[PDB]
CSV table of C-alpha atoms and ligand atoms in Angstrom, one decimal:
chain,number,residue,atom,x,y,z
A,1,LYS,CA,9.3,10.8,2.4
A,2,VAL,CA,8.7,10.8,-1.5
A,3,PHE,CA,10.4,7.6,-2.6
A,4,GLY,CA,12.0,7.2,-6.0
A,5,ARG,CA,10.4,4.5,-8.2
A,6,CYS,CA,13.4,2.2,-8.1
A,7,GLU,CA,14.2,3.1,-4.4
A,8,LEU,CA,10.7,2.0,-3.5
A,9,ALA,CA,11.0,-1.1,-5.8
A,10,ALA,CA,14.2,-2.0,-3.9
A,11,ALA,CA,12.6,-1.6,-0.4
A,12,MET,CA,9.5,-3.4,-1.4
A,13,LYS,CA,11.6,-6.3,-2.7
A,14,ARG,CA,13.8,-6.3,0.5
A,15,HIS,CA,10.6,-6.7,2.7
A,16,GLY,CA,9.3,-9.6,0.6
A,17,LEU,CA,6.5,-8.0,-1.5
A,18,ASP,CA,7.8,-9.2,-5.1
A,19,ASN,CA,5.5,-12.1,-5.9
A,20,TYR,CA,3.7,-11.9,-2.4
A,21,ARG,CA,0.3,-13.8,-3.0
A,22,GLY,CA,1.5,-14.0,-6.7
A,23,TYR,CA,1.6,-10.2,-7.3
A,24,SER,CA,4.8,-9.2,-9.1
A,25,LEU,CA,6.8,-6.2,-7.7
A,26,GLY,CA,5.6,-4.0,-10.6
A,27,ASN,CA,2.0,-4.4,-9.3
A,28,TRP,CA,3.1,-3.1,-5.8
A,29,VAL,CA,5.0,-0.1,-7.3
A,30,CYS,CA,2.1,0.7,-9.7
A,31,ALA,CA,-0.3,0.6,-6.6
A,32,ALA,CA,2.0,2.9,-4.6
A,33,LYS,CA,2.2,5.3,-7.5
A,34,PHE,CA,-1.5,5.8,-8.0
A,35,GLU,CA,-2.5,5.4,-4.3
A,36,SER,CA,0.0,7.9,-2.8
A,37,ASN,CA,2.4,9.2,-5.6
A,38,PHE,CA,5.2,7.5,-3.6
A,39,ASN,CA,4.6,9.8,-0.6
A,40,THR,CA,4.7,8.0,2.8
A,41,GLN,CA,3.0,11.0,4.4
A,42,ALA,CA,-0.2,10.9,2.1
A,43,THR,CA,-3.5,11.0,4.0
A,44,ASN,CA,-7.0,11.0,2.5
A,45,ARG,CA,-10.4,11.2,4.4
A,46,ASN,CA,-13.1,8.8,3.2
A,47,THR,CA,-16.9,9.6,3.0
A,48,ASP,CA,-17.5,7.0,5.8
A,49,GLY,CA,-15.3,9.1,8.2
A,50,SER,CA,-12.3,6.6,7.9
A,51,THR,CA,-8.9,7.9,6.6
A,52,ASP,CA,-6.4,6.2,4.2
A,53,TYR,CA,-2.8,6.4,5.4
A,54,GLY,CA,0.6,6.2,3.8
A,55,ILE,CA,2.3,5.0,0.6
A,56,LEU,CA,-0.4,2.2,0.2
A,57,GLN,CA,-3.3,4.3,1.5
A,58,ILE,CA,-4.2,1.8,4.4
A,59,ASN,CA,-7.8,2.4,5.8
A,60,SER,CA,-8.6,3.2,9.5
A,61,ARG,CA,-12.0,1.4,9.1
A,62,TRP,CA,-10.2,-2.1,9.2
A,63,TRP,CA,-6.4,-2.0,9.5
A,64,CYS,CA,-5.1,0.7,11.8
A,65,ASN,CA,-6.2,2.9,14.8
A,66,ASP,CA,-6.5,6.7,14.3
A,67,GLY,CA,-8.9,7.3,17.3
A,68,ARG,CA,-11.5,9.0,15.1
A,69,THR,CA,-13.1,6.1,13.2
A,70,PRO,CA,-16.0,4.8,15.3
A,71,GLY,CA,-16.8,1.1,15.4
A,72,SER,CA,-13.6,0.5,13.3
A,73,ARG,CA,-11.1,-2.3,13.7
A,74,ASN,CA,-7.2,-2.3,13.9
A,75,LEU,CA,-6.4,-5.7,12.3
A,76,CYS,CA,-2.7,-4.7,11.7
A,77,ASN,CA,-2.5,-3.6,15.4
A,78,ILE,CA,-0.8,-0.3,14.8
A,79,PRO,CA,-1.5,3.4,15.0
A,80,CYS,CA,-2.3,4.8,11.6
A,81,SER,CA,0.5,7.4,12.2
A,82,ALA,CA,3.0,4.4,12.0
A,83,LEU,CA,2.0,4.0,8.3
A,84,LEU,CA,3.3,7.5,7.5
A,85,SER,CA,7.0,6.8,8.5
A,86,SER,CA,10.0,7.1,6.1
A,87,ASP,CA,10.5,3.3,7.0
A,88,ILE,CA,7.9,1.3,4.9
A,89,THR,CA,8.2,-1.8,7.2
A,90,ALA,CA,4.8,-1.2,8.9
A,91,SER,CA,3.0,-0.4,5.6
A,92,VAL,CA,4.5,-3.5,4.0
A,93,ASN,CA,3.6,-5.8,7.0
A,94,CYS,CA,0.0,-4.5,7.0
A,95,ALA,CA,-0.3,-4.7,3.2
A,96,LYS,CA,0.6,-8.4,3.4
A,97,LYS,CA,-2.4,-8.9,5.8
A,98,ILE,CA,-4.7,-6.9,3.5
A,99,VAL,CA,-3.8,-8.7,0.2
A,100,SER,CA,-4.3,-12.1,2.1
A,101,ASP,CA,-7.8,-11.1,3.3
A,102,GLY,CA,-9.8,-12.6,0.2
A,103,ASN,CA,-10.0,-10.0,-2.6
A,104,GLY,CA,-6.3,-9.8,-3.2
A,105,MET,CA,-5.0,-6.4,-4.6
A,106,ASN,CA,-8.6,-5.3,-5.5
A,107,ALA,CA,-8.5,-3.9,-1.9
A,108,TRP,CA,-6.5,-1.0,-3.5
A,109,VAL,CA,-9.0,0.9,-5.7
A,110,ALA,CA,-6.2,2.7,-7.6
A,111,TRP,CA,-4.6,-0.7,-8.3
A,112,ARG,CA,-7.9,-2.1,-9.7
A,113,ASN,CA,-8.7,1.0,-11.8
A,114,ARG,CA,-5.2,2.0,-13.0
A,115,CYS,CA,-2.8,-1.0,-12.7
A,116,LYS,CA,-4.8,-4.3,-13.0
A,117,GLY,CA,-4.3,-5.9,-16.4
A,118,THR,CA,-1.8,-3.2,-17.6
A,119,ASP,CA,2.0,-3.7,-18.4
A,120,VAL,CA,3.0,-3.3,-14.6
A,121,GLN,CA,6.6,-4.6,-15.4
A,122,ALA,CA,7.1,-1.0,-16.8
A,123,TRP,CA,7.1,0.2,-13.2
A,124,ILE,CA,10.5,-1.6,-12.5
A,125,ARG,CA,12.1,-0.6,-15.8
A,126,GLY,CA,15.8,0.3,-15.4
A,127,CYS,CA,15.9,-0.7,-11.7
A,128,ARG,CA,18.9,-2.7,-10.5
A,129,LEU,CA,16.7,-4.8,-8.2
B,1,LIG,NA1,-9.6,1.7,13.0
B,2,LIG,RH1,11.6,-6.8,6.5
B,3,LIG,RH1,12.6,-8.6,7.9
B,4,LIG,RH1,-12.3,-8.9,5.4
């Protein structure tokens, strides 16, 4: 599923991401935009042989099991395929764990390089939240 911007903003808010660990909803929408282009089915192989999954590009080296990432963890206790579903529940639950892990939203490289310090409130412009 390729979410709309305000559609994703509304789902993210419903699932309790707006201000989670102090990160405003615009930060989360901005991260999703530059991680996945709002596509729940996005996958990207990493140089270490892990893969990033879903609208928030969650990594198989730590967070989910894809069966092909040796000596990896599964700290969200889910198959990586669960993070590709039209329903963002599993990606949101797992993202809450990631952002709580110590480095906050710096865990998302597209957030750090393209959203951090910018006018992220622009990402929820015009949305009836
Ligand atoms: Na894994
Ligand atoms: Rh929920
Ligand atoms: Rh819920
Ligand atoms: Rh960690």
